[PDB]
Structures are given as C-alpha cells and as structure tokens.
C-alpha cells in the first residue's frame, strides 16, 4: 500500500492530535480525522492498508501521560478505532513491521528506559513480548530489511548511543551490529534498497543534519549528503525510492520543512511544508482516503 504520506500527532507547545496526509504527486495536504488522544514521540506504520499510531506521550496542559495505545486508522472510512494496548507505555518508541506484524521497541515510561520489545498480530488483535534488546533505548530508530529488524541509536537514560542491533525472528535473538559513526538519539531511521539510513537526531550537543547509511552486506556505515536543515525528532518515510523527512526540532524552531533525498543524485531538496511546524510525529505511507 503506497500513495499518501500520513503524519499523525506531534508536538508544538503541547502534544497534537493532527492527522494530515501529503500527496507527492500534486503537492496537496489533506486534514483527516484527529487522533482520539493527542500524542508526540509516537511512531506510525501501515499493515494491510490500515494506519497504526503506536505509543507516545500526551504532553498536555493538564499533565504528561505516557501511552501504551495502539490506534488504527482506516482511510476508507476516515475513522480511528482503538486496537489492543501494549503491555507498557512507550514514549519515544520505535516501530517496525515484519511480515504483517508490528514490532514496538524500547521507549520510556516515567524515568524508566525500556529494553523490552513486543509484537502485534493484526489478525488476532494481540500483543506479545519478544526478546528484549541488549540495550535500553528511547528515541530509537527502527527499520526492517530482508525480514530482520534493526534498532539504531537512542538514549539509555545516561548516554545517547551510536550502537545498533539486529533481531532475527526465527531465533528470537538480538545481535550487535557495527555502531554508527555518530551518536544519535531521535534520528529518523529508514530503509532504501539494501541500506539502513539514519538521518539527523541529537548527539548530546547539537541537532544533526548528517545522514549515514549501513550496507548490510559490508557491515559499514558511510555518510551521504547531509540534510539542508539540522533536525531531531523528525518523522521519516520512504516513497517511490526517495526518503522524506518531516518536521523536527532544530534547537531553535519546530520545523515545518519537508525534505526529500534522491539516492541516484545523492541530493536533498525541499519539497513542501507541513501546515504547521512540529516535532515527534508518527509517519507512514498508504492508500488515499475519501
């Protein structure tokens, strides 16, 4: 399923309930049905044509509540429906999809940083815990390549991380991979062709514009062209062989900037602006609604 880039939730002054969809074919944004509960630091993904908003925190005028929610959006009806909740709240979560199943990775609850990981079965509306990561990680980037799930960077409560690890589902087992060249928490992580990209993030001192990619075959990370804007807590997704990065915080502004990376030319371009600047959104790609 692939036609619109959906952005759900986020933060500007407080957590947001926005669901908006961008159409790269015509440059158009649609406002869709609001999330039932505002959240930022959530992740998005799509399975069987449904959009899922996972985890996050409602950082609101009347409190901060970490979310264990899994909510499902149907583009055919333009409606949100609650799905089964995770075992635990997970703010600044990372999510990946392997073979129709959603993996929820790390994230925080209050002062605790999770190494736990759980897997959702859409057909059964059920979550189950799997092997935890080797490291506690929040603000972790996650991507899936060749039916293996990668957890990249993050913050363990004490240090931001350049480390990454890979989960082999048939062995329910995590293994370290080559660390990134840069410490990144809150980076955008995604897969394009045979490569895992990690774009932006925060290294403990600055929001980053640098972008590196891991070749699973060579087990090395190599920098590619940097983004035009430094940004952390950005949203990221892939559409038609190009990476799109959405919003984020640059140490000064909550960005409305959307940039697109073309791997053929190794260039980033500005493609559009979100309707308002914001960080911590969940992003995914699926069919247009009605």
């Amino acid at each position: 399923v692939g036609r619109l880039i959906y952005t759900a939730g986020g933060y500007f002054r407080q957590s947001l309930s926005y669901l908006e969809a961008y159409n790269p074919s015509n440059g158009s944004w649609l406002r869709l049905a609001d999330l039932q509960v505002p959240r930022s630091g959530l992740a998005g993904c799509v399975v069987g044509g449904l959009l899922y908003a996972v985890g996050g925190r409602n950082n609101s005028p009347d409190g901060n509540t970490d979310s264990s929610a899994l909510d499902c959006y149907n583009p055919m009806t333009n409606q949100w429906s609650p799905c089964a909740s995770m075992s635990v709240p997970r703010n600044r979560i990372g999510v990946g999809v392997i073979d129709g199943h959603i993996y929820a990775v790390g994230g925080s609850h209050g002062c605790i940083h999770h190494s736990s990981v759980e897997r959702y079965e859409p057909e059964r509306d059920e979550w189950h815990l799997v092997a935890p990561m080797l490291t506690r990680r929040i603000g972790v980037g996650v991507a899936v390549l060749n039916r293996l799930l990668y957890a990249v960077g993050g913050f363990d409560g004490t240090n931001r991380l350049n480390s990454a690890e890979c989960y082999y589902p048939e062995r329910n087992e995590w293994r370290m991979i080559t660390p990134m060249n840069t410490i990144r928490s809150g980076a955008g992580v995604c897969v394009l062709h045979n490569c895992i990209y990690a774009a932006g993030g925060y290294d403990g001192q600055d929001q980053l514009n640098s972008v590196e990619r891991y070749d699973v075959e060579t087990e090395t990370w190599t920098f590619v062209a940097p983004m035009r804007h430094h940004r952390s807590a950005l949203g990221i997704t892939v559409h038609q062989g190009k990476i799109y990065v959405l919003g984020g915080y640059d140490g000064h502004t909550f960005l409305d900037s959307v940039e697109c990376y073309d791997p053929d030319s190794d260039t980033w371009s500005e493609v559009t602006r979100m309707t308002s600047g914001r960080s911590g959104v969940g992003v995914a790609v699926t069919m247009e609604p009605c």
């Binding site: 930022s40 603000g139 913050f155 993030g201 915080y249 960080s279 911590g280």
Partner: peptide, 9 residues
C-alpha cells in the same frame, strides 16, 4: 527544554 525533541521541562 528537551534538546532532542524541543518539548518543555
């Protein structure tokens, strides 16, 4: 302010 996501604190 959280320097990773810009949120208050």
């Amino acid at each position: 302010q959280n320097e990773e996501n810009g949120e208050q604190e």
